[PDB]
């Protein structure tokens, strides 16, 4: 249970901003601001719910028509949300509800919380082509919106899901490119080829989701979830690029993106994440430390749907090969925007083509999260190391290093609020390496460092001297400390020595095959910046016990003693981990006897009050008394008394008693069965 | 930071502030995000009092952004700002440096519709045959934008 | 053979100041000035000076019953006085120099041998200990490795970042169990074929090389990387324009380049280990 910056809001919140040392939360029916420092709110606004109507239209508002004869009042969910700063500074918002309609809240040139004094709706009157809706840019049911300076207009990129609502003269379009006015009173489309639409036909058929757009290189990426092929069962994910331009889509290209388990594929993209790699993560990937790589948190689909299963994985995709993939001259045509058939697609800025085969990459968690549904995933460097930020329908929140050679598991892991882990998120990175990710759940913002997390979570020693490089943690005496808050001349960062506090069994038969339990702390090495048990010893006398890894871990061992020929009691463990040794001076050969039996005879049907008497029959692991074959089940056990009752037998005849001690056999008295 | 400040009040028309700050050891070059310094948010804005002072106190009229690689004089032209224009010119900015995309003061001018400011930066000396990036001149970007006006002049 | 018959102070035994001080410490003495007897020194089994600055170990020798020493991240270049340390069981002696470990020819007592970062070269002497248990020869320079066909006896092995091109060698090692071969040029896999033994393994990030080829407009290097079962490992991503049409992967290079590569992965399971190869095969051009 950890303690961090929680910011809490009455509405759910779609999505996320940092400007100027405050942060802008898009959220159901409201924006708030909070303060970058300690997340307080320091100002709202009400987008509020807002009334649907024919008569009433989109840039001007009305409760001036609330008595309703045919209006519906609707919630007005946040679809977008855009800083932007090339003109005088203002926030962009888009929401779901005016037929996806814009309005900029314009800074006043102090106060940044004020996105309150001066807002105005984007929705300039069409006149030359009243058939079109440039101002119409968000869809209500789903759309990203990337926005980016070129050729000094504010551009607009835009992907959007849509639904055949055929809306007179308010249409919307799956992906399209459009310009601010700088009279910022409107949007414009500079061409009929700015805007690609899957056709009339197959706007229901099914649908496009785009769970991600990000520029880079000068193309424009977008992530996509949609239709193996039309009226085609299964999903599937897609990248989108094309060239950088107001003018309109120019080299426009689909191409499919496959993540497998190593083929058991995870087809629905769920998040993503944009970076440069760390050395590490470089070096085996393809490398270039400047490079950027699509982390893209995957999962896979219940059979002949779109929807996800609890299944996650996750796999990078530098965008350098995804270019190669595209140039390298195999290729079908755009299936949802030309016909299936007609021109330009029985052929061959003009043409648009769909790819027929994925680039795939495999897992890199390699299934370290095959039972989980990962739904947002962030990314940094530390030093040499690439670091995943991740989130989950359950809550989780954790962070795990990023690597091909090593499996590696999360070294933080816990409960942020019970509502899922929203893709929505935001890194930031202060002076030497630093910085937080802010991060969603519900209706609640945090503020999650990237480092810290604090140093004083790790409990024992070795799980401290475990914790990743870039917290910088110590062990001072008896706590996970950093060495500039430590009281003690005793920090540490090297010093894991092993320490014993139980054994059991305590004692073995002279053959051996038992295999003893080591109960205790620190009994690995750190090589290599890594824990394995394959620098640990156990030393039984002068004989070793061979450890059983799969069943062993830091602070229980598991290993089977070899076979003596003499007793010997009192016997000496020792456990060395590369840096010390430890001892446990209690261990015994022994050797277990049976002096009696009684009673030596007993009817057929058995049950007799068996008592076998002797000496060292309660070492080691489990004792098995049987007779004619068939177990003799105890009822008492103890050094010197072993009680159990008889089998039942279908022959009245005599039996030897066997006991068995793990490799031990004993022999006793005849077992009389009378009728 | 003064030069933040200055920033801000560069683009605010402080004018005051910016003598005020600069007074005070403000950075006459501070960049901001996009690689603006205050001389760029002047000269976008049209703040021709402020741009004038920059430039007095040792302003860089030959900067470039790092976003799209203009240049003040490049701003003026696409914005319209012709008197900015002119001081620039005369401070001794380059009226044929190219931003990123390969495009003059004049590419933006000619294809803006800023016949003043073409006539100007043809007086100066600007290359009427330069072409940008997209292979194209601006002549070419006059024609294809309907500025026969310019063409002309141009051509 | 090394009896001190007359009490004498710990500084004139160990003539290396930090090694002198640690055995004080562990005799509850109170200086490096004051005495002790061959009785006090017989009774010494597990010594620990881990970073120690220990330069020398002189003196070693009149401690016939020592069992574990522990002398990592020392400067330790000498390994004579140990030559002789009968019942020797563990030894580390990581981050140091030792180089001449010919000098453990006769501790036919010694099982967990530790070597780590101590810029070896050869490694041949080890021949003279079949009874080893634990070796642990990573962060090295080590280039051949056939003496350890000999150490038929280790239930573990390091052997990490080093130059190891071969391991056929560790065929027959089959009582192995904790294997590491990480950062090595590892090509071939269809070595450790035989390994069904082994529980925990670690074949990574290896960085092979080929001779260097002639570079052409249009180029084809035939794969190299092998599997357990000597399947051509299928090339995970290859670089610049390159694709793999089995067996060869081909480059379509209209300028020169210096180079070309194609890092690797598959997933391996050996016995009971499931390990990951993967690596990254490169090849010179002019």
Redesign the interface.
Known sequence: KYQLPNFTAETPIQNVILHEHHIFLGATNYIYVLNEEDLQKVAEYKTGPVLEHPDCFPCQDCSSKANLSGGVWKDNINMALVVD??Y?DQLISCGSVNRGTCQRHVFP?NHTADIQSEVHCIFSPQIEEPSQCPDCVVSALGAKVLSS????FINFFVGNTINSSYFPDHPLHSISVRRLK?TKDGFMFLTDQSYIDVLPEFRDSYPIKYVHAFESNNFIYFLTVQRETLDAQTFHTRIIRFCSINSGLHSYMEMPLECIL?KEVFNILQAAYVSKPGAQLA????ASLNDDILFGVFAQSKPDSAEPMDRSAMCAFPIK?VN?FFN?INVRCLQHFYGPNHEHCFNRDEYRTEFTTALQ??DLF?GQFSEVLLTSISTFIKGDLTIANLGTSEGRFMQVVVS????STPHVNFLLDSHPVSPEVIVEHTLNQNGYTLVITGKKITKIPLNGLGCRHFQSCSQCLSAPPFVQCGWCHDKCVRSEECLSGTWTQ?ICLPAIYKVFPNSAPLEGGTRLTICGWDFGFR??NKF????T?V?LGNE?C?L???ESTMNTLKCTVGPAMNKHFNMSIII?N????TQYSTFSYVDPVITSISPKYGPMAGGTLLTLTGNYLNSGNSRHISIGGKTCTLKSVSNSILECYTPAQTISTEFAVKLKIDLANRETSIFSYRE | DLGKKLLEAARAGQDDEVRILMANGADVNAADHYGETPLHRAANKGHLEIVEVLLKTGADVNAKDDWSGDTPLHLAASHGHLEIVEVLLKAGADVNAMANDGQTPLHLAASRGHLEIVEVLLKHGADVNAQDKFGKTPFDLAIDNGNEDIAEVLQ | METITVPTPIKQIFSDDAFAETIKDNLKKKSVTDAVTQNELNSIDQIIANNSDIKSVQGIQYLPNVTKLFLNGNKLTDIKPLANLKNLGWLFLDENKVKDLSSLKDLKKLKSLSLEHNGISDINGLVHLPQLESLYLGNNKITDITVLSRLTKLDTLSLEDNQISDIVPLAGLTKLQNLYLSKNHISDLRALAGLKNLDVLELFSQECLNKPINHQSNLVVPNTVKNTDGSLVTPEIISDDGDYEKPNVKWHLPEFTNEVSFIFYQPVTIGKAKARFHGRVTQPLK
Request: charged share 35%.
């Open positions: 700063t090339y005088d040139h300076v070129k050729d000094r700088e190593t070096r085996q990937i393809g090969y190669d390298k990459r495999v390699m091909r050679s090593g499996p090297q090589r290599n394995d048990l394959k620098k010893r030393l070793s061979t059983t890894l799969s060395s590369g840096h010390g040794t």
